[PDB]
Design a protein around this ligand. Sequence first.
Ligand SMILES: [Mg+2]
Ligand SMILES: [Zn+2]
Ligand SMILES: [Zn+2]
Ligand SMILES: [Zn+2]
Ligand SMILES: [Zn+2]
Lengths: 97, 1425, 49, 107, 57, 49, 84, 86
Amino acid sequence: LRFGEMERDCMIAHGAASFLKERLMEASDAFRVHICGICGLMTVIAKLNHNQFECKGCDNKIDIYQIHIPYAAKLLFQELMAMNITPRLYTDRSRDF
Amino acid sequence: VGQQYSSAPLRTVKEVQFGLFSPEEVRAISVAKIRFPETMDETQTRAKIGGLNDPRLGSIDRNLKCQTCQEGMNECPGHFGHIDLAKPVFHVGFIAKIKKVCECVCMHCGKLLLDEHNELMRQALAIKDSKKRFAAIWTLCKTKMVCETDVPSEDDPTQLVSRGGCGNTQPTIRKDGLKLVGSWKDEPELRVLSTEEILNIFKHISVKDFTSLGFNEVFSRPEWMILTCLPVPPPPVRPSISFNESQRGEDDLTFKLADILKANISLETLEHNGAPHHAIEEAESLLQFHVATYMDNDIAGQPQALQKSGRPVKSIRARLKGKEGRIRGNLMGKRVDFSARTVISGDPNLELDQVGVPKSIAKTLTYPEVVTPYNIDRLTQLVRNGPNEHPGAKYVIRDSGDRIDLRYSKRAGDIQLQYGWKVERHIMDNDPVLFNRQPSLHKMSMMAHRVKVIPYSTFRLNLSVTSPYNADFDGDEMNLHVPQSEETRAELSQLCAVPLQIVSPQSNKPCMGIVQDTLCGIRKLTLRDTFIELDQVLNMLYWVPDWDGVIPTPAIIKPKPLWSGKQILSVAIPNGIHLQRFDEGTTLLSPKDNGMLIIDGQIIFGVVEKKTVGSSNGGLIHVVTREKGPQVCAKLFGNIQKVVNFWLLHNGFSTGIGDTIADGPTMREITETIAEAKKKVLDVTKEAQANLLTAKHGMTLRESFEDNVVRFLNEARDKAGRLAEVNLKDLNNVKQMVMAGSKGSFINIAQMSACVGQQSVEGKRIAFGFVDRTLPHFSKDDYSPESKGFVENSYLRGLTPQEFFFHAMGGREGLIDTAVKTAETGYIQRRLVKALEDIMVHYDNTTRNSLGNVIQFIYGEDGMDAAHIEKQSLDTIGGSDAAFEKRYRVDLLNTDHTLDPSLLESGSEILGDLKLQVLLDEEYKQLVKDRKFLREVFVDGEANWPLPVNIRRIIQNAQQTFHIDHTKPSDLTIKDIVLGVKDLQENLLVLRGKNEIIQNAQRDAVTLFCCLLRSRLATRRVLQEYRLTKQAFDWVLSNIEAQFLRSVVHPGEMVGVLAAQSIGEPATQMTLNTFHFAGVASKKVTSGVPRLKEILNVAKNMKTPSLTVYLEPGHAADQEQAKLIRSAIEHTTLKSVTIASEIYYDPDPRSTVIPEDEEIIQLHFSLQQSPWLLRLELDRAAMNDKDLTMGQVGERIKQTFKNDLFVIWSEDNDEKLIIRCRVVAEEDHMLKKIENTMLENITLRGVENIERVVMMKYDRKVPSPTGEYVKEPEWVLETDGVNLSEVMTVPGIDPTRIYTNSFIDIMEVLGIEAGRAALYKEVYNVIASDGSYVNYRHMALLVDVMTTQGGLTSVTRHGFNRSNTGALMRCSFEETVEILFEAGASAELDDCRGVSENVILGQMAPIGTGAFDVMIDEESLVKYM
Amino acid sequence: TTFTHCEIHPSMILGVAASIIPFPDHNQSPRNTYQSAMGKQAMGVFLTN
Amino acid sequence: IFVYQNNITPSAMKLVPSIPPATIETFNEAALVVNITHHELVPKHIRLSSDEKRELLKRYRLKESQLPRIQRADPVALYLGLKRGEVVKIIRKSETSGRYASYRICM
Amino acid sequence: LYNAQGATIERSVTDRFTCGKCKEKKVSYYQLQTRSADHPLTTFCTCEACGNRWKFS
Amino acid sequence: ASRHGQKGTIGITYRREDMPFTAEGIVPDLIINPHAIPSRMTVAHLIEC
Amino acid sequence: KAIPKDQRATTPYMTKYERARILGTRALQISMNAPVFVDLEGETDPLRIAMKELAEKKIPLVIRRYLPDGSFEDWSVEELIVDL
Amino acid sequence: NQEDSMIMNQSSIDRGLFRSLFFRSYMDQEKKYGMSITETFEKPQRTNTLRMKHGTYDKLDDDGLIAPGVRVSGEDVIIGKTTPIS
DNA sequence: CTGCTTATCGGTAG
DNA sequence: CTACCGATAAGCAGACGATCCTCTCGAT
RNA sequence: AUCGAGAGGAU
Ligand SMILES: [Mg+2]
Ligand SMILES: [Zn+2]
Ligand SMILES: [Zn+2]
Ligand SMILES: [Zn+2]
Ligand SMILES: [Zn+2]
């Protein structure tokens, strides 16, 4: 059954945050992607057995992170790339505030 | 989750930098070179061709093959490819900015059109927002059309400093299709701008000339707004639909890339071949289409872009656009696992928090419990029982990485469990489950429960949890979600649980109660007339599961030992409970069993019903929750239920047509009273027909006939009701339900047994939809009740056709504003919901949004949880100076004002103590400062207000806890009290700062609560009114602090969402377009929903813009004085008083042709122009409503056209007033130019826009001389139209109390801080018309978000959705891909503290539970062994 | 009394569904509306074949 | 502080910001008849010394912009005559706790 | 003068009503409307003494 | 649902024994709640019966 | 930025959200075969064991409360007053 | 029987109150090709292409259909039909 | 049941 | 006594439209 | 199963 917006908006209200991550991951999309630390993108080729990564273009092989995002999110991030829009993914904040 | 461990580190997402794709980074990223527009078929061979999909991306066949990457299918995402373009392209949605940037730049040299040498440009270039900067820049660069060689310097206007190069003229750019057309200026040079040249100019714009516009040197270059190389989404982004082998059906986007690549090829087929020069670009506009249609399609250009079969085709955009879309329907609201749904049934044998789950659904859902020696003994026998009997499981997952499916698997019977494996077991008794009914717009709409597995295919719940979910059992269905982590399920029973959710936060009162059978029985059971005997009583006693195992001594012994109902129901009410009511005629010895007194979980007198046991604020449920706890209170429900049901189950209760048949005399006496009620109508129908009716201030004789008539039949029906009402005995089931609150209001009695009544449409009785009649069955002009739809019969008697039909009409009217209504109600609901969101109370008790902006400095102006609040009386603002002193004044120096020693043990040696009086004067000095102060807060004098910690009870408990007696003296000192109370006003912390600014704002949050305190905890009160002891007085103080501390709001609380719903919930209850003023036209005002739709949209033009003007303090009750100010505000035009404007040919301007004027000229001569006279007749009547005289009128016209229109006028004593004016080569045509000016452009006396000014007598309650709050009525004018800027400046009015329902104006004139107030008051009365009450906090919060920014940010697309929030938050609402585009177009950065961002990223959003970290202390673990 | 036409019988202003309701003129106006939206969700013998 | 009666030439009004450090204010006669701050609704705004301001931020841990803002030409703001960066300690009456303070930095 | 004064809100009051504000027996209402019949039907009163508004169902 | 939009679902089944019989000896096939009158105002239902 | 154990403002009372997560991540470890610092008087449910671990106040976890400028205050369940 | 729900005598339910039959109908065709390559009803069994369903096929006769007498329950097969496609 | 772009007027500048 | 910048008024455009749930039919 | 619509349940 759909966990609509209104249902999400009831959980936010209650304050139960972890549960909302559960209604969004382990019981739904729950995918796992590799991003290159430098040009935060969905490009890293992952040869999972030989433990080699690399990132042609932003030459890497070293600085590579692993994310736990919903599949649909991946789809959106890709669809946007297919529209020449680059959605970056960085695993550390430089800004502060 | 995602199969197979990966070496790379696990890290969450913190930032998201939006940008654009540079062709150079497109070619470095791609792995497939894409050049061919086919699919597979290397000539039919089952594979794929190295041209389109598969060129090195993702496969289909179930082949590891993905450039050695293996993985495949569900592990490898998608690899991108690129496609070289022969000619540059416009990005569909970047059209506007591409035009805007060209308009902002000059060609040939590529530079900003305006340097800093231009000063107006500096202010624009100073703006620290890439959005608004480029906004003010474009408004300046839209004028320029020349590349300026030399420009005025910073010194003198004869010398110029040089900057840019050659100055060619620049074109005016318009949009058409997907290209840009321009016109160089000497007759236009008309030519189209090529994508090839635009990029040549966009490459050549300086590195600093980027950033000045909203662009980035790195992430977003204006040259990458033009597509040179197009990236290509893999299969997962446009996946096929495979039917075995030799059957393929592919996605739409796939066809797009074919059509694009097929066009791009036909292009390069003309370049390297014999091209027809300018026949090429014919097919170049095709490549501009396909690449522009592959992204967006609902554009301005009409070509819809079909695929054969008439298929609009989903361009990437539509995939994301709200609802069903990728963002809203697929990211914010996913479909979920571990969920269920069936028909709900009520079950009066389960506890409140419980929910009967069908055995089947418990066999289907699972919970993954990790094996431990704590549960091995159980979890193993579960696995053994398999997934068929109830207590069992359906999976066992070893720590290796593979499941064991118990429904198969040769080793279901074998199986050794191990310490650390996850058994996936059935849902079991007493697990936590989130239970929910849609449409969900409450915290209550979602609550945790305790699964109690039962047979039969229904979900079962407790009657008394029906109103929060809003359920009946007529077929409703409900959703259930099952948590999966011990940490997650905890996050339910500690927040979402049902009992925890009893004190509704939105209306500061308990939302669940006792209803129907249990509530209608508890009345029948209570009446002293109800008695129970030995045998039955014992059953009832056993029925309560908390019964002390001791049967209470019978209220009656005498001949036969009988018990009373009250006596045993009190077995359900725990120990230590106190409840005082007193209804109307309630006297400690109620002669009617009114009200209620409960001491020590015992009924003493008073029948229990709704007021006591219902969701009422001052009731039994409220108390027990604050007094005993949520756990102890939920159990209370079950007790009252289990017992009352049991009795009722045996007593019986029914209803028949006999419960709606009144007396013989009573019925005739009704029909007689409707008889005199008809002749009362007839007479005031002849009155109106003989033209004898008075007009009423309420306008129109015909309108005042309707007013009169409705109010005669409505008056008649109602007193026809009170007849049958009373004729009904006490042994009348319908009347019995009316009393117990269980259902049925009195009108239901009235209509059924007495008289249906008058039906209405829009507000007035039925109309003449049949040309001077209602049904063809009546003659024309039958304006009497039965013709105009007054149903005289009672439902029991049965309507007649005309009645039946006219009743059907009045019935439909609702169904309609339940259809037109719900649509726009949910969209105002969702808007608020999305507008507030991220606003949460932080740990410094501030109130901030995701940005980090303060919104309230202390949540709801005091820092208190809304659930912990009650309507307690402020006794200090009420009463008279006479009563005040007779009450709060203790004078130890006065023989007649001292605490009688018969009170205090230490009172007789206190009479006179000068020292004690100095700390007994300071109690008064402050109690008076409290009064003076409060009367300036609540000017109404209203004393009852929402405040934490009910004291009446907290004191009444001390009254019966320590059994204090009013006979023997107290053991407190006066130093005990004054120095005690005071030492409490230093312990009631909210904020906790170390320094000045915090502790001086802290005093403020408490200020109000304390007045309540000094109000009750004063001397002459504590000793004389309640008799407290040193012990009990210390206990009360010890309590009050605590229960005030528990009343404080917790940092984490997501007030945003909470406050939103609380307004969108009753906004859903609101009746659309009712209009209780339709019928009395010309005095209509907007009400209900559309009125709110106005406010939430910061609406400029409004339907009813009234603005209320109060009078100057003194001259406020003077009638005539009121009609003098009236006549000075109302916009009175020459057009208002004019009757007829005539034009005469009067040739000799020395004697008038008209003999009714002869007397006029004699005077205006006694004391060369033109013959075309212009006569004007003014009405004496209108000319004296707005105090004017002929001279004043004439002097005004003569100074409009001034000394070139010969004007004259009569006096104020002639049978007819006249203004004759003449003019001074077609002069009959210039005498009409001026005919219109003498009307719609000439003011006499009044402010413009202020048409109609009505006077009304208001009631005002005011501090009387004697001190009491007394009814002093003033005169006040209302109005139609707004001109606050000027009406205020008028003399005679109070320019300090002027008000307008146009809050938006009261911003522009009185300053934003007043606008806020006005905005709130304007919201309140909209929600207060419905009869709905919302706690100040929820509204004030919405009100604040609309102001803080600076102006009046609307709660629509245009408003809050343009602000500086993260990209992904603003894109979850309305304008989606339209914001995403601009997001990357201006290199934006998403902070990711917003609820929506982390929800989109599927991570734990910093919200309540997640508003912090919890780390393991190394130096507190070492101590624990 | 200038009558031109008489009505065959008031009860005919009802439609099919509505006509099955007993004593509809004894029922609250909108009630009948509801009943005329369920009788077409019932289980009868819709035809003999 | 200059008080005009109907309106000044758009040229003369731009001989106003062009002499530091002395600012110049214009005012309409009609806009000064009644004192707005006397109105029932308008709380008394107070200007904070850049000391009390630099002291305020610290105690509420703010980054300036995070503060609620007042329009630069807000009637009350021009009554006090405010500048870009200055702050007002708007102290309003409250129906949930006697008094309630609030702050507004100038836009 | 009769023209200057405005509409007078006249509505038949019932003695079959309990009020919170002034607890008086002077309350008028207006049938309607939300969802008529099943479930039930709203019933919005008023106090012309006090101003409060509540609702039934 | 009866013929007056008075709907609702079986919330439990009792047998002839546990049902309330009349002196006659009869027992009902259906037992609806007295609260399904005042609120809705279906008087035809009472009369139909 | 690290506010020290002194100069402490934020409520000394353990907020529902904090507690509801403390019990959580504790009922978590308990289920993961971890050691228990309280006598389990015939108990089998982790959440029901952490609740006994709470009134005896023997949980080794520090809550890190953030204010909206970065800086934070570190609080142990040992220090926090569990009222409710 | 509270809030829109009612008690219904089980004994009368037994004796046959409000009993109702339920008739659902499943339908299918054999689809030809412009080059004579029709489908086929039958009781299938593995063999090279393999793709099937999980239910008990053994309730079918051979023609491809069940006999009216029989008794379907779970996810059983009610119509056996195959597509020969290269 | 309204925000942003365009034209037409009334004033001030060489 | 004409040249041209600036204010204002008036004319035409866009993007929203309850939550969830079950059925049936038709098509590259 | 993807896609378009129609019929119906809950406020
Ligand atoms: Mg329902
Ligand atoms: Zn990279
Ligand atoms: Zn791959
Ligand atoms: Zn140039
Ligand atoms: Zn009242």
